[PDB]
Amino acid sequence: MQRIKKGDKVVVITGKNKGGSGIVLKIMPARQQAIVEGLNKVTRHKKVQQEAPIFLSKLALFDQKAKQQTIGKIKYVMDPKTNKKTRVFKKSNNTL
Amino acid sequence: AKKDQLTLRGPLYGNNRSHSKTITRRKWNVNLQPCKVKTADGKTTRILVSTRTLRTLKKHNRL
RNA sequence: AAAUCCAGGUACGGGUGAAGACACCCGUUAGGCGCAACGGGACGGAAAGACCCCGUGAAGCUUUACUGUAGCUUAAUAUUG
RNA sequence: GUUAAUCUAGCUGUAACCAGUACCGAGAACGAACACACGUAGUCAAGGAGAGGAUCCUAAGGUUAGCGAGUGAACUAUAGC
RNA sequence: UUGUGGUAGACGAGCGUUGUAUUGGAGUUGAAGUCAAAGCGUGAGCAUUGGUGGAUCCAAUACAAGUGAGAAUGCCGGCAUGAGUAACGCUUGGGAGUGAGAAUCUCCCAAACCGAUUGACUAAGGUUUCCUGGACCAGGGUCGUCCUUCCAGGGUUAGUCUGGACCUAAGCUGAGGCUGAAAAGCGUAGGCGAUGGACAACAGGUUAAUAUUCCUGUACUUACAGUUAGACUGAUGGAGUG
RNA sequence: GGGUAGGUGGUAAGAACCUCAGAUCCGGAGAUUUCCGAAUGGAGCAAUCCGGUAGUUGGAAACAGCUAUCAUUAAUUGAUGAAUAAAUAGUCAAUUAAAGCAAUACGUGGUGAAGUGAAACAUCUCAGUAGCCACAGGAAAAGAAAACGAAUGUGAUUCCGUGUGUAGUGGCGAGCGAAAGCGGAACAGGCCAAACUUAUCAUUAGAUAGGGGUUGUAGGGCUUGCAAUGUGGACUUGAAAACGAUAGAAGAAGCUGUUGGAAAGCAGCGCGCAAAAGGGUGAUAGCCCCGUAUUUGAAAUUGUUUUCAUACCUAGCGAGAUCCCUGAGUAGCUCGGAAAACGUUAUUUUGAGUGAAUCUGCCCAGACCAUUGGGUAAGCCUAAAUACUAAUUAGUGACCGAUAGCGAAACAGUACCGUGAGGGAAAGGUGAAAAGAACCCAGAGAUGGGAGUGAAAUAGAUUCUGAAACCAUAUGCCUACAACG
Ligand SMILES: [Mg+2]
Ligand SMILES: [Mg+2]
Ligand SMILES: [Mg+2]
Ligand SMILES: [Mg+2]
Ligand SMILES: [Mg+2]
Ligand SMILES: [Mg+2]
Ligand SMILES: [Mg+2]
Ligand SMILES: [Mg+2]
Ligand SMILES: [Mg+2]
């Protein structure tokens, strides 16, 4: 599928911001960009706090069902018997 | 075309190797004569035919 | 704008010299720098001299130079009795 | 063609397709490498004197020749003497 | 001990460059490249420090070559000099206005040339150069608020005009066909081909830009049916005219 | 069918919508496919003009919409029909093929130079090269012996090495240069004409369609018997299966600290492997992501092979006897020329002329004759090895890295030159990301100077670095009686 879909929580692994948990709004799959709300607000000087895209490498999904709300990889291989392709964390078993 | 109509034997191209062996390109033209012929539908025709095939026509009695 | 241009702070006489010198030699003269001029020189500039010669170089032209040839003409043979 | 077609004259009605149509037409739109003194078919062609479309000046109309301002030396062109 | 000048030219030993291989190793605590400096070598050449710069690179041994530049009236790019020199390619004076800025633009008034023309209409060409508003990187041999330049918007209106839908000349093409190694060449019927023949529209007005085209007024033509009357029509061909 | 969650092509933000009832996207198959163009209704200055015919709709009718058809040539079929009575030419109609393009390449075939070399030059070479032209093809051409050629011999063709720079050939100068033999890649040989026989053509057949038969230690036909039911393919239709090609699915493993703008480096402690190929991620990542190794999967279209059935073709050993057949303007011979290594010569071809024989035959073994020996022309067909790659896919490089490399890294065969054929360029890089520099002062304005973002604005849109020639500014020293590579 896609490791990053519009809507799900996501945090930053590298850059000037660390642990900048926020929500994703737009994804440009062609150029590998994401627009996470609440992050990298650059003060545009129009002749405003529109966001700045963050490359999908930096982003990482946010576990929310485990007591330790840590960060992990994703499997797609889980195709539940009564479901289509789903996301499940490698160092856990938590769908989405 | 200066070739005959029964067969298509055309001119032969060679050299005019004179004395002292100077070369000069030259053509040999088939002997064409207007002798008649008779087909097996009537339609007697006059065709430009070469002499070598004229002899063959003369012996196979195609006139 | 231009052609030009080995670097230049680029005198004159006699001599010498690849044989006619801004530079060499020996004398002489001359503060530094422009502007308008004129043309003696720098064998000035523009053109790898047109003449001449050389190349086992080119092209054009000529002819009773050579070798061939398109054409024109003559004979045998086929077309053909 | 007559058991009427076709034409002529008139009345009523209908239709009249396709491309060109601006502007320049040359001392600045064309051919000259240019906003280059050159070249390019035909048409209209006023008045005075005059044979006249010559020649001098003007009309209808139209242009400011897309670097200026001075001085009035040599020197050059052009005119005048 | 004997020697060590040297072009053409023979021979020997060597430096450097680019890359590959294995071996060591330096680098955002700043790599190569680039300039600067008062170093070291017998030479080709080689280090050291600092500024700049912002990611690759140095040494050792072999190997392979687009391997080493001052000259070719060398090629390409840049820059001088000549020089702020010659040239700026037929013409004026002013008032008022605009504008930050005017000889140069707009208006006015003269002035000076043209006038068998620098005037007016069009063909050929060219292809938006036309009209209005705006702009002043570049082009304009100066300047410029302005240009035939640039930008946004716009304009070309036909039964009768120029040409097709009619005609043919020179000529071009050319079914069959003739000739020619091949392609092609020649050519008949047909078909094209105006610079020519035949065909019906005049005057005036209007818009910033069109006009025998639009509008106003008055016209003509060529077809088509339907209708009234008269009449027998009379061609793909013959003749006359053209 | 795949495939998810965004998307409406790039300079591109905004405006207005479609979409998670499964769009866009990707792959297969389809339909639409204006006009010119072989261009083909007729023209024509290419991309425009003018039509005919047959339907249908509108209209009272011209006329207009809307459909299809309308070139030439060759073959075949039918109809019609001349001077001329019949017949043929011709004309009309119907059906089926191509005409063109390009892969600047490869193949064949026709025609065919010169420069140059010879230190000049004509014989000769360059060269059967370039060019022009016709013709296809996926490869073509060639080809199954009237052979090689010296032997108790090989046994279609093609291609590579060697023979060898040999034997020869050459104004015996320059130069040219095989055929055998040998080692190899690949390997298949089939079928007509004619004798004889059948059926039919006013059967004057000398013709049409069958059977039969294919050749050399000669064969086949003609008369007579035995054995055969089978391999074999240069090959027709079906069915089944396998392996692929065209979208894709899953696809392991990491944190901490320091410099730091950002660490993925450096350092500490781990970890995974059929994956340490590669690309991106703020600086050099095996563990951040996308992939890769591996394991997989196709509704539809397509390729190669295999299996079973299925046609057509294809099969063997003897006996008799003057029987018949065994490719005619042909092989030769002569005149002029050429291919072959050979500058004309056996062999091979031919523009002109002449011209045989028939198994006791014909041709051949470098003029020629005899002996010996080899092979049977004058008819057709043929996969494989071979040559070439503009093209599709994956990938490589001790190949180039913007004066290079394709002429061309970008809207290049463009702009531009030329009437036309044709000739024919130059130039790329901000930063990690526009956070493209709001605001203030001067100014008419571009712009500049502060501010602001940012690691740096000596990164500022003149945009990576930024030498030299070159032009200006400045500390320090010298120079206005001086002859200066
Ligand atoms: Mg001189
Ligand atoms: Mg003029
Ligand atoms: Mg005129
Ligand atoms: Mg007058
Ligand atoms: Mg006059
Ligand atoms: Mg001067
Ligand atoms: Mg002067
Ligand atoms: Mg002057
Ligand atoms: Mg012999």
UniProtKB/Swiss-Prot annotation, chain A:
Keywords: Ribonucleoprotein, Ribosomal protein, RNA-binding, rRNA-binding. One of two assembly initiator proteins, it binds directly to the 5'-end of the 23S rRNA, where it nucleates assembly of the 50S subunit. Disulfide bonds: none annotated. The keyword Iron-sulfur does not apply. PROSITE patterns: RIBOSOMAL_L24. GO terms for molecular function: rRNA binding; structural constituent of ribosome. It comes from the Bacteria. This is Large ribosomal subunit protein uL24. Belongs to the universal ribosomal protein uL24 family. SUPFAM superfamilies: Translation proteins SH3-like domain. InterPro entries: KOW, Rib_uL2_dom2, Ribosomal_uL24, Ribosomal_uL24_CS, Ribosomal_uL24_KOW, Translation_prot_SH3-like_sf. One of its GO terms (cellular component) is ribosome. One of its GO terms (biological process) is translation. Pfam families: KOW (PF00467), ribosomal_L24 (PF17136). Part of the 50S ribosomal subunit. SMART domains: KOW (SM00739).
Swiss-Prot record, chain B:
One of its GO terms (molecular function) is structural constituent of ribosome. HAMAP family: Ribosomal_bL28. InterPro entries: Bacterial_rp_bL28, Ribosomal_bL28, Ribosomal_bL28/bL31-like_sf, Ribosomal_bL28_bact-type, Ribosomal_bL28_sf. GO terms for cellular component: ribonucleoprotein complex; ribosome. Residues 1-20 are annotated as: Disordered. GO terms for biological process: translation. This is Large ribosomal subunit protein bL28. Signal peptide: none annotated. Keywords: Ribonucleoprotein, Ribosomal protein. Belongs to the bacterial ribosomal protein bL28 family.
